[PDB]
Design a protein around this ligand. Structure first.
Ligand SMILES: *[C@H]1O[C@H](CO)[C@@H](O)[C@H](O)[C@@H]1O
Length: 433
């Protein structure tokens, strides 16, 4: 029952929580009525009625929708760039994100253009020409690919949007039948990173490099150690991973902030369900996964796949079905973290979690202490928070009985915060000392 919270013991910095609007999935929303646009963007970004999300991940398209859809005559020949100021809805989405509280934009390529790769195709894998052990008859396209990624960044800068981070790979351990590009190791990745870093700096930009968005955490572990041995981590700003093939239950050995940059239930229907049977698309399942990432794997960020799309399955947090906008249970799992744990928060020490209650705590830059308690028991659990002396508490809960986060009746005795955590619920305490 007694949880100790220790703000003098701190761990990782929190960068935030977010999602993507890649592959044109958000473009019908970008083109919808002002009323639909407002409903969708408030669900994603509002800190009072939505999920308060703080990170947007955009895709850099490789062929169709690319800024360089047609090969030049060779790897050092003058490119022909295109720019429509739309980017399949991502310019609109980026401007909405900046207007409504997003702290970081990350632009991530799923592949280089086909003419820069060993397989001369945007899909079914292939390697960037000129990386270690990847010789192409047409030559070494490393500088061409760095120049291409910088032009995309400048295109966004010309629309007034500053990209914070750039990634040059997506799941490079995976070769599906759509935009993809591989690496054999972090050692091979290290043959391109210095070229990209130098090209960004030379263009007068400060964009940070993120790598390498593996399909699973086990490759993020392997590749980070290889990048460190190759001396490439000095050029990186973030280490990234997806959680599809494997999840994190331990932190990566790095001083860089680590982002979980894509994870979702891709298979199941969209559901408003918070808890029913522990299914993969349930809100409470996702509360526990975010908890695992932030508390067990020391993540600085946790991203879903798609924020909002039309006729969504579970791959999206919010759906647009005609003119009707609906929030998933998963959206409210994100909300119970993201509304309250703001960028530049630091995770802090807790001890004394009851059985099957997952606890985390955070200190915001403004000094608020956020304690999250996920009760996975089939019964209410009474807790007390010692180690902090509260002057005030605002608390919120989410369970099957409410349709969105609702005021929670916290106790406060002699500066000790407490409460009765409902069964199969999440409670967030925002404590002022
Ligand atoms: C949203 O949809 C409109 C047409 O309905 C497009 O013109 C726009 O670029 C966006 O895709």
């Amino acid at each position: 029952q007694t949880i100790t919270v220790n703000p003098s013991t701190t761990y990782q910095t929190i960068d935030g929580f977010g999602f993507s609007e890649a592959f044109g999935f958000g473009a019908p929303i970008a083109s919808a009525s002002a009323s639909i646009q407002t409903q969708v963007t408030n669900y994603l970004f509002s800190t009072t009625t939505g999920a308060g999300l703080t990170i947007l991940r955009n895709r850099i398209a490789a062929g169709s929708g690319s800024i360089e859809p047609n090969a030049p005559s060779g790897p050092n020949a003058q490119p022909t760039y295109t720019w429509d100021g739309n980017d399949a809805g991502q310019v609109w989405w980026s401007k909405q994100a900046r207007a409504k509280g997003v702290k970081y934009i990350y632009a991530d390529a799923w592949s280089a253009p086909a003419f820069m790769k060993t397989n001369d195709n945007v899909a079914n894998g292939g390697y960037l020409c000129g990386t270690t052990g990847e010789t192409c008859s047409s030559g070494d396209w490393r500088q061409a690919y760095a120049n291409y990624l910088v032009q995309y960044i400048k295109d966004y800068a010309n629309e007034g949007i500053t990209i914070d981070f750039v990634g040059w790979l997506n799941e490079p351990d995976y070769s599906p039948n759509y935009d993809s590009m591989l690496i054999t190791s972090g050692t091979q990745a290290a043959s391109f990173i210095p070229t990209l870093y130098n090209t960004i700096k030379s263009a007068g930009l400060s964009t940070g490099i993120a790598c390498c968005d593996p399909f699973g955490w086990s490759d993020a572990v392997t590749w980070t150690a290889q990048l460190a041995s190759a001396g490439a981590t000095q050029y990186l700003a973030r280490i990234t991973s997806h959680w599809y093939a494997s999840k994190g239950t331990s932190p990566i050995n790095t001083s860089l902030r680590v982002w979980e940059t894509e994870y979702a239930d891709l298979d199941d229907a969209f559901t408003t369900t918070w808890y029913s049977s522990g299914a993969a698309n349930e809100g409470l399942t996702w509360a526990n996964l975010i908890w695992q990432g932030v508390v067990e794997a020391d993540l600085s960020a946790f991203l879903y796949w798609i924020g909002a799309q039309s006729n969504s399955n579970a791959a999206g947090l919010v759906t647009l079905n005609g003119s009707t906008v609906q929030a998933s249970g998963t959206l409210w799992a994100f909300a119970m973290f993201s509304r309250f744990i703001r960028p530049d928060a630091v995770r802090i020490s807790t001890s004394g979690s009851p059985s099957n209650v997952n606890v985390g705590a955070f200190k915001n830059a403004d000094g608020s202490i956020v304690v999250v308690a996920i009760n996975n028991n089939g019964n209410s659990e009474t807790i007390s928070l010692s180690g902090i002396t509260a002057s005030k508490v605002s608390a919120y809960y989410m369970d099957s009985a409410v349709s969105s986060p609702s005021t929670f009746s916290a106790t406060l005795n002699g500066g000790t915060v407490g409460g009765s955590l409902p069964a199969r619920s999440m409670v967030t305490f925002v404590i002022t000392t």
